[PDB]
């Protein structure tokens, strides 16, 4: 949709692509050394072993000054240079820190290793026709206090928050089948493939939890369409018992769904 309506720097800095970010920084960096060279130059021949007036001699000097490399070939002369050498060194620090702050922020974006089942199903469970889909954790580290939100979307556009058998799993480690008993209170009570489509119904799934791996929260999203609900489907058990009498988890069949056919 067409939105009718610098200024938002911290956001843009984080949002912008990695390449763009590196440029914006290289730019700010090249530029400030360019201002510091114009300073050293503006004091007269204040740098030693730099050609008189030569901007490029003061640039490389300022670089190894803000950058504290300090080769020694080009040193400052007097109180003037030695005071732009003092401030400029402060700017390198102030410079670096902000960089690292942003570098840390954009970098430390943790991602849930969560895999969503490609389809949903509606089949009977505990007597009631129940809407189901399932999640699986792609990593070893466990997600504590996971919890899922199952939201229906349809035209009437309205959001309905579908009640779940289990809204939150205190320890999500392997797999988790989420379930919405369709009882007389379900927004989709007596609904049907046809009726569902007519309303343009979609399904939003929201996952979050604490990730032990990162020691921070994570979030995952996914959305299904009527198209993607298998009426009467049952998710294939994804847990085996190997030769060795041990239990195992086969994600190979994570999106497998069983169904019965006749005429």
- Interaction residues for K ion, span 37-76 (CB under 5 A): 68, 70, 72
Instruction: Extract the runs of DSSP E, i.e. beta strands, from 108-198.
Output: 114-116, 120-125, 128-137, 143-154, 158-161, 168-172, 175-181
Regarding 255 and contact with a copy of itself (CB under 8 A), the answer is: no
What is the enclosing helix (H) or strand (E) of 221? strand 216-225
Residue with smaller CB distance to K ion, 5 or 72: 72
Interaction of residue 108 with a copy of itself, rule CB under 8 A: yes
Position among 20, 44, 53, 82 found at the interface with a copy of itself (CB under 8 A) = 82
Among 164, 204, 232, 234, which residue interacts with a copy of itself (rule: CB under 8 A)? 204
Q: What's the gap between Cα 240 and its chain centre? A: 33
User: Residues 25-44 vs a copy of itself: string with x where CB under 8 A?
Assistant: xx--xx--x-----------
Long-range Cβ contacts of 52-61 (<8 Å, 24+ apart): 59/33, 59/34, 61/37
Question: Do 180 and 165 meet the contact criterion of CB atoms below 8 Å apart?
Answer: yes
The single residue among 19, 190, 245, 252 that binds a copy of itself, judged by CB under 8 A, is 252
Residues in CB range of 225: below 8 A, 6 or more apart: 201, 202, 203
Choose between 241 and 263: whose C-beta lies nearer to a copy of itself: 241
Q: Is there a contact between 147 and 122 (Cβ–Cβ < 8 Å)? A: no
- The minimum distance between CB 168 and a copy of itself, in angstroms, equals 8
**Closer of 24 and 89 to K ion (Cβ):** 89
195 makes contact, choosing from K ion, a copy of itself, none, with CB < 5 to 8 Å by partner type, with none
Provide the mask over 129-168, with x wherever binding to a copy of itself is found by CB under 8 A and - wherever it is not.
---------xxxx--xx---x-x-------x-x----x--
Q: How far apart are CA 41 and CA 58, in angstroms?
A: 7
Q: How far apart are CA 255 and CA 92, in angstroms?
A: 53
Q: How far is the CB of 166 from K ion (least distance, A)?
A: 52
Which conformational region is residue 127 in: left (phi greater than 0), alpha (psi within -120 to 50 degrees), or beta?
Answer: left
Single out the residue of 31, 35, 105, 258 in contact with a copy of itself (rule: CB under 8 A): 105
| Residues of the shown chain interacting with K ion in the complex, contacts defined by CB under 5 A | 68, 70, 72
């Amino acid at each position: 949709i067409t939105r009718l309506g610098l200024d938002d720097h911290y956001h843009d800095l984080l949002t912008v692509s990695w390449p763009v970010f590196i440029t914006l920084i290289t730019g700010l960096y090249l530029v400030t050394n360019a201002l510091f060279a114009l300073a050293y130059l503006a004091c007269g021949d204040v740098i030693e072993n730099a050609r008189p007036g030569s901007f490029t001699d003061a640039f490389f000097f300022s670089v190894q000054t803000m950058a504290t490399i300090g080769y020694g070939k080009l040193i400052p002369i007097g109180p003037l240079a030695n005071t732009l050498v003092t401030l400029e060194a402060l700017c390198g620090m102030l410079g670096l820190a902000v960089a690292a702050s942003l570098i840390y922020a954009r970098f430390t974006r943790p991602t849930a290793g969560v895999l969503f089942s490609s389809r949903m199903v509606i089949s009977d469970f505990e007597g009631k026709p129940t809407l189901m889909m399932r999640l699986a954790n792609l990593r070893i580290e466990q997600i504590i206090e996971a919890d899922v939100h199952l939201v229906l979307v349809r035209s009437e556009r309205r959001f309905h928050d579908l009640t779940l058998t289990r809204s939150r799993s205190p320890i999500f480690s392997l797999s988790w089948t989420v379930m919405h008993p369709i009882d007389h209170h379900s927004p989709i009570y007596g609904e049907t493939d046809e009726t569902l489509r007519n309303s343009h119904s979609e399904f939003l799934v929201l996952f979050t939890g604490h990730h032990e791996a990162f020691a921070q929260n994570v979030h995952a999203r996914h959305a299904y369409s009527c198209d993607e609900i298998i009426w009467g489907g049952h998710f294939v058990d994804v847990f085996t018992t190997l030769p060795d009498g041990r239990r195992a988890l086969d994600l190979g069949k994570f999106h497998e769904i069983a169904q019965h056919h006749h005429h």
